[PDB]
Structure 1
Amino acid sequence: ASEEVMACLRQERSRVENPSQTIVNVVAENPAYLHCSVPPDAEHEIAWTRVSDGALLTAGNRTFTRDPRWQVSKKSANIWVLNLRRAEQQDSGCYLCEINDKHNTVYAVYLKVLEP
């Protein structure tokens, strides 16, 4: 279990440590919110990917996946949020937020959905 989280979080590629949560525990059927930080005043686009299958979930301000439970939004000037509206145990695993910036920043988040 520790190795699985480490294998996820080792995938971060960033100039400065991720300032946001990178381990998210939620109860099944509740929503989850994964955060991706971007510099102030930049105009970068971001993409969220699910690592287990490589599925592209969102790209830019559009959802890409056809799974209706996912939405991306700008929470504030510096924070994008991937919202998973009704988490299930099968959603547990590694998620990545990639930024189209010059250093090709990648943030990794591990999601654990607890099944009662």
Structure 2
Amino acid sequence: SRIVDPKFSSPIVNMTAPVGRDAFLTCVVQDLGPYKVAWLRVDTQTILTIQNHVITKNQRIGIANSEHKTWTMRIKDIKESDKGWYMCQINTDPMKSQMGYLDVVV
């Protein structure tokens, strides 16, 4: 039995934030179902989170969701090196994703 793919309800909300403040990036998914939402950093090619699990060893990354639709990654105490592109990816076949950015102003 085939099920619908999840669909993104809105584009990724980007964030601009000063060094040392906390940053958030949010992905809004409709009809997630049995699929999973993963955050990745695109510059560094690094897996950050999958569902409610932080994969990276970086202790400043957190992840939370409400109703499996709004998925918000937290980057605690941001440094200048956190500036870059971040992907919200769903494990459909083919894979679907959208990208946002965190800008760290100096």
RCO higher in structure (CA 8 A, sep ≥6): 1
Unaligned runs of 5+ in 2: 1-5
Quickly say closer, same or farther: Cα 1:16–1:78, change in 2 above 3 A: closer
Higher-strand-fraction structure: 2
- Within the candidate set 75, 81, 85, 2:76 is matched to 85
Residues 1-116 of structure 1: pairs in structure 2 closer than 5 A: 19-40=10-31, 42-115=33-106
Q: How much does 1:36 deviate? A: 1.2
- What is the aligned residue count? 101
Unaligned runs of 5+ in 1: 1-14
Q: TM-score, normalised by structure 1?
A: 0.75
Distance 2:33 2:8 in 1: 18
Q: TM-score, normalised by structure 2?
A: 0.81
CA RMSD of aligned residues (A): 2.2
Identity of aligned residues (%): 23
- Report the AA paired with residue 58 of structure 1: T
Higher-helix-fraction structure: 1
